[PDB]
Ligand binder design. Sequence first.
Ligand SMILES: CCOc1ccc2cc(-c3nn(C4CCOCC4)c(N)c3C(N)=O)cnc2c1
Ligand SMILES: [Ca+2]
Ligand SMILES: [Ca+2]
Length: 421
Amino acid sequence: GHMGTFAERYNIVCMLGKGSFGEVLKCKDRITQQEYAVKVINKASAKNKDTSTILREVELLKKLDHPNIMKLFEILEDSSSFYIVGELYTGGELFDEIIKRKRFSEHDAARIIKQVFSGITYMHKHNIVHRDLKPENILLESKEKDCDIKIIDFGLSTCFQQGTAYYIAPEVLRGTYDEKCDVWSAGVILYILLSGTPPFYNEYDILKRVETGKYAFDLPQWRTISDDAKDLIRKMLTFHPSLRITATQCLEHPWIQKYSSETPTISDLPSLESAMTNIRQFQAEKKLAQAALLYMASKLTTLDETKQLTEIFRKLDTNNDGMLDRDELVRGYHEFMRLKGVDSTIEDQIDSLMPLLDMDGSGSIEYSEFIASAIDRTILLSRERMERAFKMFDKDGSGKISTKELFKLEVDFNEFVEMLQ
Ligand SMILES: CCOc1ccc2cc(-c3nn(C4CCOCC4)c(N)c3C(N)=O)cnc2c1
Ligand SMILES: [Ca+2]
Ligand SMILES: [Ca+2]
């Protein structure tokens, strides 16, 4: 009775800043000591629809599993607010990276932009349009060199109530927000990465250039840049959306494939054999065992644990869409053998393995499912991790979870620990 949803699992550490829809704070899990980012949205001030509609949309966002899209874990609430808890990212906005470097080589801008293309492509396939894509709405996961980027600030426009001029498409000036407007804003970003200037440079004047749609590669720094880059930018800053290319086309452009070739090497063999061994054990264990492992890999893990497996996941992602498909696993298995020196069926193993790892039936293995099968089970079996998992299921809080109270797909905690092992 005297226990609250959020305040019982989480402790507020500090305030990270003001998201447009609500305050954003850093919070800590009281058991696992794992830190998180939570947006606190005031129900009375911010709501436009029913609480049911909101939670339905947030459920859809919570199942967006893409390396370049912000991760959301759960949606709680009390009498005054919604609490949306998500993965914490500490590298800051991409806008600041641009102030420091002030422009990027074609090699550096391609690694960055390839990730934006991957995330936007994923968002559109799940029928989400950012409508406000810019560097300020892209965060870096950490301070390391080649860390992945993360797209934020999208999804709640319909549900809640709450520099932009450079990045908006002309049709947005005329009351149209279709999927193409994002491809326009991405083009402006890529224009700024290579040159350091907005293609369209008072705000009435900036918007005036946007309305005409006139941009030029006249700045002295474009002479050195390649023709394929200019081909991509032209197809993205096409005035008419019906002729403008798609996010998928942006990702597949030859320019991207030139600088997007992260491929396995002999240095990665230690982490590939480990990943392979855990994957076999995963396929051997019964369905009940497997699902419990996915549940904990997808809800109770952090980046630092999966940091080694992130690079392996990124190298196996030839097309850079963010997912590993049936063919990509066959080729990664054949190349894993080649680096060792072993002659290589592999195809039969993977086809038998695809249903077992693609627990959602999505047609490909997303990152969370890859971690659940490629990580040492010992890491997931930590006592605090199992404490949190057990407490999630016991809605009553009696101390024993009923048989139906198990939705991992009377038992004491100590009986629960043995069951996982
Ligand atoms: C359905 C909506 O759900 C969510 C869930 C998680 C979110 C996290 C952030 C976030 N903002 N910031 C700062 C804040 C000050 O400005 C710079 C960036 C972080 N360092 C964040 C993080 N996740 O680490 C923002 N919006 C979120 C919305
Ligand atoms: Ca892929
Ligand atoms: Ca999947």
